[PDB]
Amino acid sequence: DKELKFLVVGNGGTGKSTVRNLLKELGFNNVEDAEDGVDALNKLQAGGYGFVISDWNMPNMDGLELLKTIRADGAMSALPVLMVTAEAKKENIIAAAQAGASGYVVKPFTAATLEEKLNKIFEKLGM
Known part of the structure; x- marks a missing residue:
């Protein structure tokens, strides 16, 4: 369903656009936003x-702490999380894998790339 709800945490710029x-364009209109990890966790309690x-980089609470926290929450631990960064670091990619992320993408990127990403995650999660 194109009725699947997204939460876009952080700045969300992509180069010539924004994640939202x-x-x-891919057809996903049901999207809301958050500014940093703390804002994200508050909105996430509204559920749905x-x-x-x-x-990856955000003030107050970064991408990694946010991710370990969603993974530990028995209520939303099976929740899909795709990391977005503009600085590709082996050490950050390793850290995100063992912490349980569903993917990693390096800006700038286009609609093409986000589609291959989303799809691959839908398949390996079976949805």
């Missing part, structure tokens, strides 16, 4: 989301 704008897209 690229989602609309099905996928999260987050920045």
Whole structure:
């Protein structure tokens, strides 16, 4: 369903766009936003989301702490999380894998790339 709810945490810029704008071309209109990990966790208690897209670098609470926290929450631990960054570091990619992320993408990227990503995650999660 194109009725799947996204939560776009962080700045969300992509180079010539924004995550929320690229989602609309793929057909995903049901999206809300958060500014950092703390804002994200508050909104997440309202319940009803099905996928999260987050920045690595954010103020107050970064992408990694956010991710270990969603994974420990017995209520949303099976929640899909795709990491977004503009600095590719082996050490950050390793850390995100063992912490339980569903993917990793390096900006700038286009609608093409986000589609291959989303699809691959839908398949390995079976949804």
